[PDB]
Amino acid sequence: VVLQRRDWENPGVTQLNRLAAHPPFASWRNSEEARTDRPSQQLRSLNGEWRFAWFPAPEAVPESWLECDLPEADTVVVPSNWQMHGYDAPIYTNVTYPITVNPPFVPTENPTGCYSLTFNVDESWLQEGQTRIIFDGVNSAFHLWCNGRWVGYGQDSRLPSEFDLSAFLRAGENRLAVMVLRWSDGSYLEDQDMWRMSGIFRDVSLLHKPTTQISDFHVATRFNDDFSRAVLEAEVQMCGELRDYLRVTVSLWQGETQVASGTAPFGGEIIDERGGYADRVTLRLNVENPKLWSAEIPNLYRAVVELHTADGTLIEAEACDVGFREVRIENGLLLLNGKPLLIRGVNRHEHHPLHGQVMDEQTMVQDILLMKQNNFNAVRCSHYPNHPLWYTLCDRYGLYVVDEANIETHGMVPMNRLTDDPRWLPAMSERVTRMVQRDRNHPSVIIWSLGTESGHGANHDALYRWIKSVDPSRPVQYEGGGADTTATDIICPMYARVDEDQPFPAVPKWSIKKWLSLPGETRPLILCEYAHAMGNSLGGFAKYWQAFRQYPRLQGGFVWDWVDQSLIKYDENGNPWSAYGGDFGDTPNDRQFCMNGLVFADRTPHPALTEAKHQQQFFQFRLSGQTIEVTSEYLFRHSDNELLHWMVALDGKPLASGEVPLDVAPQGKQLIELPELPQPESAGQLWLTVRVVQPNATAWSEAGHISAWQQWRLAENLSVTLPAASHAIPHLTTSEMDFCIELGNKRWQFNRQSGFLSQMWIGDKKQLLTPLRDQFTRAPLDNDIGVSEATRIDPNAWVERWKAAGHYQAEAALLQCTADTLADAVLITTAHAWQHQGKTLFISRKTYRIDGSGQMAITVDVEVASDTPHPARIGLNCQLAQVAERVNWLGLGPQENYPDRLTAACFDRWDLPLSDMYTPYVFPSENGLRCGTRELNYGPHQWRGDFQFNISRYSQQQLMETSHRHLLHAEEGTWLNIDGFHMGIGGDDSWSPSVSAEFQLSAGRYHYQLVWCQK
Amino acid sequence: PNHPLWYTLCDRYGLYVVDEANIETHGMVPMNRLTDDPRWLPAMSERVTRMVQRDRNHPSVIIWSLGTESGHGANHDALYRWIKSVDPSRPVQYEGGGADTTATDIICPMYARVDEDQPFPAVPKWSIKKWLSLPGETRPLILCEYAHAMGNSLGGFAKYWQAFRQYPRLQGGFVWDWVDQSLIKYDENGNPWSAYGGDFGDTPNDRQFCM
Amino acid sequence: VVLQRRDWENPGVTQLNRLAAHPPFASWRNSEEARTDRPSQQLRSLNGEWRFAWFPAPEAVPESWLECDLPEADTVVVPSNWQMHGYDAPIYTNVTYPITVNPPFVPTENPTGCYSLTFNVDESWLQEGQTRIIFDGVNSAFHLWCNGRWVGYGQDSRLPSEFDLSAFLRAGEN
């Protein structure tokens, strides 16, 4: 009958014989174990070695598999995704569905995972009460059998399905058989931009509950206006036989202290003409001066819910952590405990490079710590309810959570084709209702979300009202269909820009500043997604935080996103590499679009992470004279674990430093008076650097963790001294093909046919492998490429503008190349015109002045045609012969930084191994730039001026011809790119031009100068 | 929802119609046990959605109703909003759980009296004159059921109509009801007689209350 | 499948293969007839004499009935309530449920009406287009079979259940 029905092609059937959803249960039989949250003997894990077979369709499954283990089957670990064991390929597709859009039908070729487990059940479990099995995550649908007999069916990949097995089990050995379908009608609601995988990918467990049981419970906390008094209100529901002697005690614990308690018989107040719930009771406990919960200080109490007899004999106990906090939207602001929030948030998919979409404690804890260490206070569960441990950890470490229903229909045309259809309302309701029923007691959850990218349909409106109806404690948000519809309490656009309107028809993304004040609008604005961190990105991130700070109603947003969705593959030798869309044979695919992380799949930071930590700082700084003004952006806590380290350096040389403890109240100010700074009698720029240090370890950080920093230029003393003139004067050696300049061991050569420095010699040895030439291009970034492909060009992307204008294949044409012997130097003048198909793109006018001290002063003046697309950069490159261990520079650093992403970088003297000057982006592009650099040192070379540079063993050309990082080979010598000017990287999104006007190279005429010498 | 022809006739002869979903859970304890249970939302929604999709073009339909005597549950709320979302042209009314919940655009009590308060716990039937002016209340009041016409009845009918006329916001009501639900039985001689509850062997029954 | 599933004791199955609801259709092929609201050749009444048998439970319904008329069955007029024909009793209850309140379950003794009809279909409806059957009201749930093959299932006594019979029909007798 199971093959006959095809429930996996019926959106009307989303479960069979499935128990109601409810908050996390453990069925403790001792109230103390409940209080302390110790393991419970009534909740057994079924995780571990299971038997697995793969089949191309459910019709291909043999009927014997219900009765006997299959010999051809293997033994695999559960939980797991079966794509992660090599049974089939994972598919990466963004928008377009991984299957043909023919609702409600799926392909007849429907990969089918048959899982089985022979396991033991004790006698005690079967003489009394109720034995249920819980599947926390099954992708995407499944039928369940126990000892040959059919139990039930379930959908929704991301919420627990629970089945009563009491009537199916026997003492001793038992066998489960689980038929998991890759594709079902649920897939239509699971079109998240992520790897499409399947199987039993979350925990499986058995729970024993008494016959008379707690079947549900809800905890609410309400406050007076100043938060000095709370009422905890706990509503408890039982199943079983209703008897007079039945009682519930809800008791509230702070550590080992019981702060409050209440006990009542069942039978709530009269509700309507037929009475009340005889199977319910509401307990109300008064709490004076409650410790409030926030992400800053996650104060938790323990609620123990005891079901017992009048006389005091326990039946069972459940429990949860309670955070006393109010979430309300008042007067257009989202308030926590009466204070306006500034969401420093991130989107976080559940992703692991080895285990796929299986989650474990270690990884979750690792994620939380990195998040907090980098100044995040919020996470969006993009785009499904998470592993249940996640909320628990968020409660305990303190993050604000957006809990999001598992509904995404992005690939539909138009996006709301299902969500407007009343026939898909049942399947949608269950994905929202079952989330609320499960997660509503977690204080970390502050906002409910109706899903993502499903357009705006009437079903959203119904479910919005439903949530507001059952849970008035939390705002409901939803971005779809324009981000400000009647199904959202919060204007929550994705990738809406700061100042720039993008007025799309029907779904405009307004400038977020403009959006707030549209006629009639009053709601707060928090971006559900912003700052697409794909490859070398996060350009313009500071612009967001400047606006968030200035506008009370701009209350932050969630970065897209936390971690790259790269997956580990292995080569012939056996070494791992990071893989994206299309690397498992999967087609069609959206390639590197699965990697948008602030961190790599192994949780190593991208350079952008540091930019986020800095902009997301909690202490603001202003300098007047010798006074640092510190302002706190904390809402609740004092800076009771903070000192300020100040430091003054002259072009990187330390002159003074000190420490002052920070004692600033939430939203408050502290003035720090620096001691007399010693005026240096030496040319240079004085810089002030302050760093906020946490001297003590926390649950989330180590002692000496730096949480904030800032810099200022203090006094500058410009160099008025002429260098001591030299005896020697360089000699010019004119040839047919060459101008050679000699001075001591040093020699320069200008090729008269190309017009460039073709070679330099120090003593005997050659310094160049490639001549010094102008460069106007870069290995295109993900943002430069957007959605452009080889077989579907987007002529709007920066890369295509560059290609079509001939930037990548323009040829230097020599207009001029003269030599002149001066009094104490040799002067080489040049002029080039870069042309493509008769159009002059660029003109470079240079002079090289080689003086008697062996220094070469290079002066570059570039004309850029007003009607050519603005170039990626205006600089020079060459390939040096030298491979040295270290790079030393006076500029912004130490990490990679670009004109629109340099706020986190500090001006100082930095020294790193060459390998740190390369950023290993999985899709290779221009990388490792450092800006505002006054001096660069590499081997015997030193460059001086005011430039940006990158330095690496990889040419711009190899970076742009290579698709994966691991396929890069180190070239001979070191590619040096020195830019006078470099275009922003953008990232407001990654599918249109996103580089802001003020970071484009549009001036038409550009000037830079460099001195080159041996030291 | 009625036989489709009823709406056509009302369109053409001229009657205002309250079109009502086929949802009644009166015998539940308490009355909202189903309608507050999310597992019953699917079944409930199809009873509301499929009504609106069918009858939304009839001009005679001026008010949608979410059903009757099913208490007030969160499912009413979702469905209220569903209708308001798909058809802003018509008010949505529903009596359950006190006649003035958030699932109704109209205070629509049943058998609320003119001057006499009946202060039942949780679900009081206030005097309709009094109901209109309860703190914060602004809605119109039309009784979904009044003047129970059972047997020799309709005493005090004039009192309703005097109040309906004097109070702009008391905008009338629906008598309970049009036609006796008596069925024809035939005796030993084959002579027709009027039958109510209990006359078909039916037990437990509620006797003449079908009339 | 049909009897093992017990779709009538499941609030999650309220229909199987039912067509989407919609305002009244007549599929006129002449604009003037549509304007005047005159009859339409594309909408046929199947009201009249059908065949009917009563059963104490769905378990008691013989499998032969899907393939052939039951000889003991009577000819009755449809539409009708089978209590008005005297097959069992109509029950009058006000508030209290006519059955034991135990959701989602109903009594095992569940009176089953077995209605059948033999009818012809116009030549042209089989070659081209879509032919659906509409049941304006069925109390309280039903399974539908056309020519021995199962079509679908319906709930809600008071709204039309509709099913595509396009692939079920044959020339001559259905």
Ligand SMILES: CC(C)S[C@@H]1O[C@H](CO)[C@H](O)[C@H](O)[C@H]1O
């Ligand atoms: C127009 C498309 C690029 S949509 C775009 O794709 C992104 C790729 O990372 C993210 O998934 C966003 O959520 C989505 O809005």
Ligand SMILES: CC(C)S[C@@H]1O[C@H](CO)[C@H](O)[C@H](O)[C@H]1O
């Ligand atoms: C308290 C009960 C009498 S309820 C009362 O019964 C009436 C009897 O005809 C009607 O059915 C009303 O709708 C109902 O409210």
Ligand SMILES: [Mg+2]
């Ligand atoms: Mg299904």
Ligand SMILES: [Mg+2]
């Ligand atoms: Mg998407």
Ligand SMILES: [Mg+2]
């Ligand atoms: Mg059913």
Ligand code: NA
């Ligand atoms: Na703000």
Ligand code: NA
């Ligand atoms: Na993506």
Ligand code: NA
């Ligand atoms: Na590349």
Ligand code: NA
């Ligand atoms: Na009036």
Ligand code: NA
């Ligand atoms: Na009656």
